[PDB]
């Protein structure tokens, strides 16, 4: 009756920071502790996560344990109640490349008199070799929109929207796309103003 002690056992994954999370089921019970193990898909042995043994907290950070971009993984949570009732439940198969959400990029929006400059910064990740999203996804590109709607895009870092009215407010949106993995970030947005045009006669 595992679903009565454990439910929603799943990795939450953003920019490759991978946190195992779960909740308690309907059948009880305030006197419960959890123990976490993980394994690589295609290997035999489960490994106990030090620091996530008989915990009462309902999450366990497994970022590094699941940080090999060539592997897939599973985790499992074993609940034990003070009365001795117990249940174990495993996650679905975890694929960091497929499953990890891309966060909005950090972007620098710079105002000029008749243009807005936008610099997309590379996204560092906890992947160790630290790799950026750009290093990981060869077909990553940026989609930039300036509402006045102008659009630009590409793999390069910096873009400048020209032909703008001075002393005027615009809204820019920048998103990361990885078309091959059907991945997209939510947009980063910047509301900025072109500089005044002080030209005299």
């Amino acid at each position: 009756d595992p679903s009565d002690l454990l439910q929603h056992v799943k990795f939450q994954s953003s920019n490759f920071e991978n946190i195992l999370t779960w909740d308690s089921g309907p059948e009880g019970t305030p006197d419960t502790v959890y123990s976490i193990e993980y394994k690589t898909y295609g290997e035999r042995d489960w490994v106990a996560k030090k620091g996530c043994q008989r915990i009462t907290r309902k999450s366990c950070n497994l970022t590094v344990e699941t940080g090999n971009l060539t592997e897939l993984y599973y985790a499992r949570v074993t609940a034990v109640s003070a009365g001795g009732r117990s249940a174990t439940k495993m996650t679905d198969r975890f694929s960091s490349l497929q499953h990890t959400t891309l966060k909005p990029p950090d972007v620098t929006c710079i105002s000029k008199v008749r243009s807005i400059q936008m610099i997309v910064h590379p996204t560092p990740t906890p992947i160790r070799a630290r790799l950026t999203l750009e290093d990981i996804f060869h077909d990553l590109f940026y989609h930039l929109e300036l509402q006045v709607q102008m659009h630009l895009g590409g793999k390069q870092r910096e873009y400048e929207f020209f032909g703008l009215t001075p002393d005027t407010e615009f809204l820019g949106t920048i998103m990361i796309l990885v078309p091959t993995w059907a991945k997209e970030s939510a947009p980063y947005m910047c509301r900025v103003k072109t500089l005044p045009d002080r030209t005299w006669t």
Binding site: Y41, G42, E43, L72, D92, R93, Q98, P179, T180
Partner: protein, 131 residues
């Protein structure tokens, strides 16, 4: 030889493919054996990888997806015709493919389910090798 990038830039069908694999992996209780990864490309050059994945793709269509055509609906009926088109486009290697075939066979029907559960891996290996 090659597949055009546009075949991999369509979120609906990519997602259905992943969804098909997900559903099958739910029926796959064998966490100890991985079919596609690793060994499959041992001794094969980057330039030969697309051809290897053609063979793996055609094996999967003919001996895996075919016998299991009733399962995992409605994803199966949308994804197979897509993968079949990719095959039509492509219309020591033998050694590595045979090992995968052997493993699927050894696992029995559960091996066929395993292969469908690994379509995400087949699909993305196809993409990396062929674009």
């Amino acid at each position: 030889a090659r597949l055009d990038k546009s075949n991999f830039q369509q979120p609906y069908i990519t997602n259905r493919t992943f969804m098909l694999a997900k559903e099958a992996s739910l029926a796959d209780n064998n966490t100890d054996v991985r079919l596609i990864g690793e060994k499959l490309f041992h001794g094969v050059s980057m330039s030969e990888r697309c051809y290897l994945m053609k063979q793996v793709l055609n094996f999967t269509l003919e001996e895996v997806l075919f016998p299991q055509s009733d399962r995992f609906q409605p994803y199966m009926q949308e994804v197979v015709p897509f993968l079949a088109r990719l095959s039509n486009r492509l219309s020591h290697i033998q050694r590595n493919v045979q090992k995968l075939k052997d493993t699927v066979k050894k696992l029995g029907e559960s091996g066929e389910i395993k292969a469908i559960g690994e379509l995400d891996l087949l699909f993305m290996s196809l993409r990396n090798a062929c674009i």
